[PDB]
Ligand SMILES: *[C@@H]1O[C@H](CO)[C@@H](O)[C@H](O)[C@H]1NC(C)=O
């Protein structure tokens with residue numbers, strides 16, 4: 001079974017000597033710490049609110065910053081959010097669109113600041 | 125003792141331990157596979173007696189590497205994080221087949237290890253049945269273990285090449301030594317007694333009759349080693365709990381309700 005946050009075919013395996021810490025044992029399709037990631041997805045559907053894929057760059061080239069980042073943890077939408085699980089935001093670097101917004105985006109470093117830029121992921 | 129606490133995706137709090145807890149856990153779990161490292165840290169107050177410990181093994185095309193680190197000072201957990209032995213997990217059906225991809229420890233001081241956890245019905249623990257890998261745990265060079273009517277744990281740890289290949293370890297592989305213990309798991313005092321708990325027939329290396337407890341208030345008795353009965357083991361033998369008062373002695377009815 002799963003009941004640990006193990007999305008999809010996730011299997012919950014724990015670890016006695018290491019303080020019942022858990023990890024999920026993912027099937028091929030779903031990567032990430034909960035099997036939260038559909039790594040087959042190549043386009044996004046509609047607006048993106050659902051998109052859990054793995055676009056990580058932006059429409060100029062630049063790479064996305066990790067929802068982890070010490071940088072990003074000041075920004076409102078980031079991986080520590082109490083809600084972050086259901087919105088796709090996690091220890092990755094991908095694109096999401098948790099609030100509203102035409103397509104999926106991510107926090108991009110440019111010079112010094114952290115602008116929110118728009119991802120690549122082609123629409124269907 | 126003040127010490128940062130925080131599960132996986134959480135931010136950290138300044139937790140602050142009570143009389144009993146005097147160390148600061150900083151467990152990290154990592155995985156590599158097809159150049160994707162993903163690493164999950166949890167921190168919090170530790171306890172009286174836990175030990176800088178390390179484990180790693182491989183399931184399929186990946187390596188998971190658990191490590192634990194403790195210290196007895198204020199917020200000493202914070203922001204930032206060779207010898208061959210057989211490997212495999214029960215999970216991917218690899219420790220059970222007469223074949224199992226192997227591995228080589230990356231720290232001197234590491235060991236070779238087999239860890240067994242066998243549980244019945246809807247089992248309280250999400251732990252592989254059999255695991256073989258590299259690393260150091262409580263009371264290493266040597267062995268620990270304890271069996272109950274419905275449960276059987278056992279560790280084995282050695283400083284010699286592939287010291288852990290060959291046959292796995294079931295129940296029947298142990299010589300009913302002849303000595304006995306008790307097995308109890310209901311609730312509090314009257315879930316089990318001289319009435320709803322019976323004498324187990326102790327098996328081989330197990331010869332210590334043992335009890336366990338913690339505060340809602342879970343309790344367990346049976347047949348164990350002297351290494352098991354000592355150190356961190358027993359404690360983690362179940363989800364979480366107190367100072368988990370624990371007891372050992374010689375005798376068949378050693379562990380009968382006192
Ligand atoms: C558990 O912890 C404290 C340590 O401060 C101890 O004094 C207390 O009696 C223990 N509880 C028991 C043995 O029930």
Ligand SMILES: *[C@@H]1O[C@H](CO)[C@@H](O)[C@H](O)[C@H]1NC(C)=O
Nearest residue numbers: 174175176177192193194195
């Ligand atoms: C545990 O780790 C610390 C710091 O990481 C190290 O200095 C210390 O010696 C270790 N504990 C023991 C008891 O050796």
Ligand SMILES: *[C@@H]1O[C@H](CO)[C@@H](O)[C@H](O)[C@H]1NC(C)=O
Nearest residue numbers: 206207232233265282283284
């Ligand atoms: C343990 O292994 C080390 C090297 O890993 C070696 O120097 C030593 O001879 C070994 N000793 C024992 C008792 O296993």
